[PDB]
């Protein structure tokens, strides 16, 4: 459902 629009910035 949710995309890496939960984070993404590696780290």
């Amino acid at each position: 459902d949710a995309t890496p629009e939960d984070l993404g910035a590696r780290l």
């Epitope: 890496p4 629009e5 939960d6 984070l7 993404g8 910035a9 590696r10 780290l11």
Partner: antibody
Framework: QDQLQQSGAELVRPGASVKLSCKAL????????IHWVKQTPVHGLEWIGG????????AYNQKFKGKATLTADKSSTTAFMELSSLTSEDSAVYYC?????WGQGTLVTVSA | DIKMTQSPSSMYTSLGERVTITCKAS??????LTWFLQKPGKSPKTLIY???RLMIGVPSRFSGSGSGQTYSLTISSLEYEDMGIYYC?????????FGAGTKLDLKR
């Protein structure tokens, strides 16, 4: 699917260490960061840090830099958090999260 | 460190009632916020991600809004299943930060 399953309760002695695990199921492990959160009656919720299984990148709460170590293992789609020099102040429930999904948590009790 | 000021801290409510909870970021967080609920002795359950997106499986009586520093979680009609503590989480920038949460309680 959408799931994070955490290792069982831990009963550990002061000065010792523990390594907690967080199995990821239902999504692509190397596409999302996995984070760990501490929760205690007295201190509430506290972000510890995160790891990106894909790039292996990490970010820690300054407060845990040197106390907690985050690692991830691609082949078993499992994130890990190791805590050293346990001290009762570390007795708490620990959660791994993807920010949307949350593990069921792991109870850690530091006692002699 | 972004500070999330959440309010009210305590909610005295009735079933069927409409409920609004608020989180104010000490700075712009660009809708990178989640609203989750936690019941006694249970693990957190996310209701909303990215300020206004419904978590799959979550009932539509839940909705979020806001855009800069002010975000709100609204429960159109309170149900018994909804009792517990609500929390907001900002993840726009490290360290991840939480609101102090608001306790929902049935009035009488």
């Amino acid at each position: 699917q959408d799931q994070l399953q955490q290792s069982g309760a831990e009963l550990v002695r002061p000065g010792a260490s523990v390594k907690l695990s967080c199995k990821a199921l239902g999504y692509i492990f190397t596409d999302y960061e996995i984070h760990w959160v501490k929760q205690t009656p007295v201190h509430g919720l506290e972000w510890i840090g995160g790891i990106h299984p894909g790039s292996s990148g990490t970010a820690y709460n300054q407060k845990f830099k040197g106390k907690a170590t985050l690692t991830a293992d691609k082949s078993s789609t499992t994130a890990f958090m190791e805590l050293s020099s346990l001290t009762s102040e570390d007795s708490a429930v620990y959660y791994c999260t993807r920010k949307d999904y949350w593990g069921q948590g792991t109870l850690v009790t530091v006692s002699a | 460190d972004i500070k999330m000021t959440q309010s009210p801290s305590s909610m005295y409510t009735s079933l069927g009632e409409r409920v609004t909870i608020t989180c104010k970021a000490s700075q712009d967080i660009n809708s990178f916020l989640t609203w989750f609920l936690q019941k006694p002795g249970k693990s957190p359950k996310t209701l909303i991600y990215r300020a206004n997106r419904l978590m799959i499986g979550v009932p539509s009586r839940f909705s979020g809004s806001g855009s800069g520093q002010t975000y709100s979680l609204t429960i159109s009609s309170l149900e018994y299943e909804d009792m517990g503590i609500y929390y907001c989480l900002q993840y726009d920038d490290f360290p991840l930060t939480f609101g102090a949460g608001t306790k929902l309680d049935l009035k009488r």
